[PDB]
Structures are given as structure tokens and as C-alpha cells.
């Protein structure tokens, strides 16, 4: 067999190393252990003992505030992988708060299952440009390593392998340089191909059976494995429990007697916080699903025909949701007799997990809350959520409170996402990328939006850096040149045409013809879409303006496609009357042109009658080039040559290889005639370099004056 140890569950290593007598002979792990809380220690204590009997881990391991403790390869060599059945705030391993930590070991690791590791604030550590994690993780997006001695920029890290003694060294470039992939200055790392990476390479032979994992004491032997991807029973990794046996916590099978007494030890006159394990799904799992309960002694769960909701009365009358840990603490809860809060962080998405964890939940007894969820985008993982009933509210009768979400831009498609925010208010500020119309749909599905009030929702925000809108622009005519282009499109008059002030145009180069469908990130400008505005046209004709809008772009490279779209620019609204309007983008070529100059000619021969002429294209090759016209003659006979080079005069003064005059003579007219015209070209000039504030004020002032005039004169009588 491969897994001989005794059941040795979690324990805290704290304030005395004598606790390793709980590791008297152990090799098995369940739950987690905690290596910390040892201040008066030094290498004697970590050389007083070293207990290499271990097998592997399941959940995680921990490191915190212990001095010395140079590395781990001496401590726990026989230690294979972690299963990540649990986590520690979206991480499955910790490296934190160590002093005199020379290196680490862990040259025995092949596939970390879930989550990531955490390295931080251990300022005496290096040799970590030789350790890949994608090759040890089936998913790498959330891992986070920072603040060590390597962050001082030293430790050239001479690791051995192909260099310093051939020792079966698989180097593996991932970015542009191979590296002797290792763990220390005196160890190595084990690379696999995908032939057997699923269930592991082995230089013993070349692979293992495809139900082993990690390593195997014999290549191609389904019992001499070291790790198991799926299951375990009687000395061999497997992929199923045969059905007199039953499954418990992703790491084994046991017999029905085992699971029933592994419960019934606690089914006695002493509460020890234990849990109500029952057979189900061919799986000795903790509790019963919905439409499943167990009030009997048949020892299997059974469906209440009615709903068996997964009610879970919160502690504290509340709860924060901050991590996958807090999330998993409710997977297999559906109803919440409490109130949740969602305060997520980090540049990492979690809707995948929460749609596994929260993607069943349907009824919060109280209220939702949202708070500075940076990387979040949606309520998408909330896909069964219906009833935020009116029985609990935050300060100010709020039934809903979202804020500081710098990336939220859409909740649902509202196909049949039938919910009810039955009572209570909303709250929305600093919610930029979310449209307003979607909030209006939320108030519509809600019910009485009359519950709302002034400033319950923001209007200066929530669609800032981009937004959907209600109405669209269209075009009437376009005309182009090689150096210039025209656009003339439809005019738009809001119901109070004074409220409008011009059109906002956008364009750019775009050889890649699938560019962003984006409004524009004009945060101090900072987006290379060269934008310029335009004064609006007149109200000349009362039914329909015979003058269409227009502004002429110009100075563009010839034979260059160009995306171009525009959008309104409107007075800051007061009620939900309009979202302005926009145009879609148009990839637009630039017309052909005659004058482009090829570059860098050549003039040398292989023979006298021969000449090798070579050259380059222009800076403006101007699209499809037909061919390269050429001329040449005996243009070599000036009068500058029959009357030179006498006896005492210079011998070979007119020895003009690459003759002077035909060459491009120097120049100094940088910008004088038609480029002082284009002299508002500039640098450090913003893309919103205009105090429109003053102009907004001017427009509002003119409106005030005219409104005052008309509303005075209009009716000084009842008739």
C-alpha cells in the first residue's frame, strides 16, 4: 500500500514544539495545521526534530511569526499536494511573516488543486525565478507573491541542473528565457508533458496509469501511485467507490459501517460541535440537499415532498461576504434568516465560484449590500435571487445599498429574472459603468418606484466613462479625399433644443478592424482617440434644417482605414429625460494618392554595364502599389568637367561617386507656410483642454435671460 498512516486531523502548532508528539508516528492529514506562535525559537528547535513521515495535505497550511526556520526540505520532504477543499481567504497556502527564512523546500509538489499560494513580507528569500505554478496549478489567476529579498533586486540565483552537475534538469521557458527549474540551490523541479500531466509524469518510466496522480512508485502500475486525482481505496488510486462503499470528503471511500459509526460516535449524550452526516449520492456527505431531509434512523436522506429549504440563520444578525471562504461557508445554504453583505476586493473575478456557491440562493430574509467591489461586473452569479423582502433594512430604511463599484456595468438580461425588492430604498453613487436605464428596469421589476425619492439615485454618475443610450444617430452623406475627409450627418433637436450645445466626435486609426465599441475614457483625456467638438447648426428652417451638421477631418495618412463615431454633448440633466444619442463607428478608408517617395535607394554594380538598383517603400506606400516607374539617361555631362584637373591643379577633385546635386539637399523650413497653419499641434495639451464650465454657465445664463423675457411678457391677462 501507499497510504499507511493513522488518521491525524488538524492541530495548532503554537508556543511549544512539544506538540509534534501528536506527530509521534503520523503520516495522514485532515483539515489544516498552523505553524506559528514561536518567538523564542531558533534552528536548535527545528533541528531538535524533523518529522518526514507525512503524506500530503487537503485544505491548506500556514506560516506566521516564527524566527529562524531556514527552509522546509529538511522538515517535511514527504509531502505531495493540497486538495483545497477549504481555503484561507481565496488562498490555499501561506508564506508570511518569517524571519531568517533562507529558502523553502517543496521539491515534491506536482499539482496544487484549488486556490493559490500566498507569499508576503519575508525579506530574506530568493530563488523564485525557477518555480512555475501554472505547471503546478490547473488554474493560475489569483496567486500573489510579493515583498521578499528578491524585491530588493539581488540574488542572481545560480541554481544547478544542466549547469553545475547534470541531474535530470528540465528547464522550461515560459516568457522568453529557459531556466533550470528547481526549488533550491541543491534540488530540482519535475516537469511533465500533457501526455501524463493530468495524472503525472515519472522519470522512473515515463507515465503512470490514468487514475494515479502526481507520482507513482512504479511507472505504469495503478496501485503504486503516490497521488490520486479522484478517490482512494486499498492501496490503489481509483475513480469510483463501488456501492457497498461510500464517499467522504473527496479523499477516500469507506464502508457503510465506517460512515455510520464515524457519525454515531457523536450521536451520544455530548455535543462536540459535530455534524449530521448521512449517506446520499453514493457519498457520505455532511447534510441533506433541498427536497431532502432525514428524521428517522434509516441512515439515508429522503425527500420531503414539500420544499426542504436550506435555511441558515446568520450569526450577528448579518454577515459580510469578502472571500471564497465566506462564500463556501454558505454553499448548500439557500435561504438566509439574516442579512448578507458583499464587500469584495482584488483584481480577480469570483462569479464562477459564487455561481457554484451563491448560484442556488433565492431568499435573503433581510437586505443585500454592495461595497467597493472593484473587479465585480454583475449580479450574474446571483441567478436564483428573487425576494429581498421588507423585514430588515440598513440605516435609513434601505433595502439595497451599492457603492464604489468601479466596474459594474450590467446585472442580468431580464429574460425572466423575476424578483421583488418588496420594500425599502436604493442607494447608488460612484457606480459609473452601470447604465441608468438598467436601474430604471430594476425599479420597474421592483414595483412602486414611488418608494424612491430625490437623491436616492445619482445622476451625475453611473454611465460616466461609457454608457448605453436610448436614441441613435444616422448619416446623410460622406465625401472623402486623400488628405481630407468630410462627414455630413443627420441633425438632432432635443425637445428643448437650447439644452444641446454641440456634437462630440471621435475617431482613430484601426488596421485591426474589430475595434472597441466604446464611448471614451476622457479622464484628463488620456485616450488616444483624437477628439474635437463642433458647434451645432441653426434652427433656421422650422420644420427641418436644410443645413446638416458637419466637421471636416484632415491631415490623415493616405490609404489608412479609420474608425469614426460621434455622440451628443448635452447640458447636465435634471430628470431622466434623455441619454443624449450616439453614432456607431465606421471603418473608413483614405483615398489613393500620387506623391509618395520611396526610401533608401542603392547604386552599386556587379559589372560596368550592370548596375544593382535597390530601394525601399515609402512612409506612405499608398495602398496597393501597381509598380515602380523608373527613368535614367546619360545625365552626366555638365560643363563642369571639360575644364578641370590641370597639371598642378587637384588630381581627382571631381571624383563624384554619389554626385552632389541630385541628392536631397538639406533644408530648414520646419513649419512656415502650410504647417504654421497646423501649428496648434502640441504636446501636454489635454484632450479636454477647454473650460466648458464657463461655457456651460454662459449657455445657462442665456437660457435664463430668454426664459425670463418670454415668461414675463407671455400672459399679463387671463385672455
Amino acid at each position: 500500500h501507499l497510504y499507511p498512516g493513522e488518521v491525524c486531523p488538524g492541530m495548532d502548532i503554537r508556543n511549544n514544539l512539544t506538540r509534534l508528539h501528536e506527530l509521534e508516528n503520523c503520516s495522514v492529514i485532515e483539515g489544516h495545521l498552523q505553524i506559528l506562535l514561536m518567538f523564542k525559537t531558533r534552528p536548535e528547535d527545528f533541528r531538535d526534530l524533523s518529522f518526514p513521515k507525512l503524506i500530503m495535505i487537503t485544505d491548506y497550511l500556514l506560516l506566521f511569526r516564527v524566527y529562524g526556520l531556514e527552509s522546509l526540505k529538511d522538515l517535511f520532504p514527504n509531502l505531495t499536494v493540497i486538495r483545497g477543499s477549504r481555503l484561507f481567504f481565496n488562498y490555499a497556502l501561506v508564506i508570511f511573516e518569517m524571519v531568517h527564512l533562507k529558502e523553502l523546500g517543496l521539491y515534491n509538489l506536482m499539482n496544487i488543486t484549488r486556490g493559490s499560494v500566498r507569499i508576503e513580507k519575508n525579506n530574506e528569500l530568493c530563488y523564485l525565478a525557477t518555480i512555475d505554478w501554472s505547471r503546478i496549478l490547473d488554474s493560475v489567476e489569483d496567486n500573489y507573491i510579493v515583498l521578499n529579498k528578491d524585491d530588493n533586486e539581488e540574488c542572481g540565483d545560480i541554481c544547478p541542473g544542466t549547469a553545475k552537475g547534470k541531474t535530470n534538469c528540465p528547464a522550461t521557458v515560459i516568457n522568453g528565457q529557459f531556466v533550470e527549474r528547481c526549488w533550491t540551490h541543491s534540488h530540482c523541479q519535475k516537469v511533465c508533458p500533457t501526455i501524463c500531466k493530468s495524472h503525472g509524469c515519472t522519470a522512473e518510466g515515463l507515465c503512470c496509469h490514468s487514475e494515479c496522480l502526481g507520482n507513482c512508485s512504479q511507472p505504469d502500475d495503478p496501485t503504486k501511485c503516490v497521488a490520486c486525482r479522484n478517490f482512494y481505496l486499498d492501496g490503489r488510486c481509483v475513480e469510483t467507490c463501488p456501492p457497498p462503499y461510500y464517499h467522504f470528503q473527496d479523499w477516500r471511500c469507506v464502508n457503510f459501517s465506517f460512515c455510520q459509526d464515524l457519525h454515531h460516535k457523536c450521536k451520544n449524550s455530548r455535543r462536540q460541535g459535530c455534524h449530521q452526516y448521512v449517506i446520499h449520492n453514493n457519498k457520505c456527505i455532511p447534510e441533506c440537499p433541498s427536497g431532502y431531509t432525514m428524521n428517522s434512523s434509516n441512515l439515508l436522506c429522503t425527500p420531503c415532498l414539500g420544499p426542504c429549504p436550506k435555511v441558515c440563520h446568520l450569526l450577528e444578525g448579518e454577515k459580510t461576504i469578502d472571500s471564497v471562504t465566506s462564500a463556501q461557508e454558505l454553499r448548500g445554504c439557500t435561504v438566509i434568516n439574516g442579512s448578507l453583505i458583499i464587500n469584495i476586493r482584488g483584481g480577480n473575478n469570483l462569479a464562477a465560484e459564487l455561481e457554484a456557491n451563491l448560484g442556488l440562493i433565492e431568499e435573503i430574509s433581510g437586505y443585500l449590500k454592495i461595497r467597493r467591489s472593484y473587479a465585480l461586473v454583475s449580479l450574474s452569479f446571483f441567478r436564483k435571487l428573487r425576494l429581498i423582502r421588507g423585514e430588515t433594512l440598513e440605516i435609513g430604511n434601505y433595502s439595497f445599498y451599492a457603492l464604489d463599484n468601479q466596474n459594474l456595468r450590467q446585472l442580468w438580461d431580464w429574460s425572466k429574472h423575476n424578483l421583488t425588492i418588496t420594500q425599502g430604498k436604493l442607494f447608488f453613487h460612484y457606480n459609473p459603468k452601470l447604465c441608468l436605464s438598467e436601474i430604471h428596469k430594476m425599479e420597474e421589476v421592483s414595483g412602486t418606484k414611488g418608494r424612491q425619492e430625490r437623491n436616492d439615485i445619482a445622476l451625475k454618475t453611473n454611465g460616466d466613462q461609457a454608457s448605453c443610450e436610448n436614441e441613435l444617430l444616422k448619416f446623410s452623406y460622406i465625401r472623402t479625399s486623400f488628405d481630407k475627409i468630410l462627414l455630413r450627418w443627420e441633425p438632432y433637436w432635443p425637445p428643448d433644443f437650447r439644452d444641446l450645445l454641440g456634437f462630440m466626435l471621435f475617431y482613430k486609426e484601426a488596421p485591426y478592424q474589430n475595434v472597441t465599441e466604446f464611448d471614451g475614457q476622457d479622464a484628463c483625456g488620456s485616450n488616444s482617440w483624437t477628439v474635437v467638438d463642433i458647434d451645432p447648426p441653426l434652427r433656421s428652417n422650422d420644420p427641418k434644417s436644410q443645413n446638416h451638421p458637419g466637421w471636416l477631418m484632415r491631415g490623415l495618412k493616405p490609404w489608412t482605414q479609420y474608425a469614426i463615431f460621434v455622440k451628443t454633448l448635452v447640458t447636465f440633466s435634471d430628470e431622466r429625460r434623455t441619454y443624449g444619442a450616439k453614432s456607431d463607428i465606421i471603418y473608413v478608408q483614405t483615398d489613393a494618392t500620387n506623391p509618395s517617395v520611396p526610401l533608401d535607394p542603392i547604386s552599386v554594380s556587379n559589372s560596368s554595364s550592370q548596375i544593382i538598383l535597390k530601394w525601399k517603400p515609402p512612409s506612405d506606400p499608398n495602398g496597393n502599389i501597381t509598380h515602380y516607374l523608373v527613368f535614367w539617361e546619360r545625365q552626366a555631362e555638365d560643363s563642369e568637367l571639360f575644364e578641370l584637373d590641370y597639371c598642378l591643379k587637384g588630381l581627382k577633385l571631381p571624383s563624384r561617386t554619389w554626385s552632389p546635386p541630385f541628392e536631397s539637399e538639406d533644408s530648414q523650413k520646419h513649419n512656415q507656410s502650410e504647417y504654421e497653419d497646423s501649428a496648434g499641434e502640441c504636446c501636454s495639451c489635454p484632450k479636454t483642454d477647454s473650460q466648458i464650465l464657463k461655457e456651460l454657465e454662459e449657455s445657462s445664463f442665456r437660457k435664463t435671460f430668454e426664459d425670463y423675457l418670454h415668461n414675463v411678457v407671455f400672459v399679463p391677462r387671463p385672455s
Binding site: 426664459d707 418670454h710 415668461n711 407671455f714 400672459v715 391677462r717 387671463p718 385672455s719
Partner: peptide
């Protein structure tokens, strides 16, 4: 008020029959 009547709401004829000829 004219602009309250007209520049926010619509000003039908009957909304304006008071002061014509």
C-alpha cells in the same frame, strides 16, 4: 408660465387660446 407650460410640457392650442385674436 410659458416655458413651464411649453418648454417642459406641450402647449396645445386650447392651452393657448386665451391671448390670440
Amino acid at each position: 408660465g410659458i416655458v413651464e407650460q411649453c418648454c417642459t410640457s406641450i402647449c396645445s392650442l386650447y392651452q393657448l387660446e386665451n391671448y390670440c385674436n
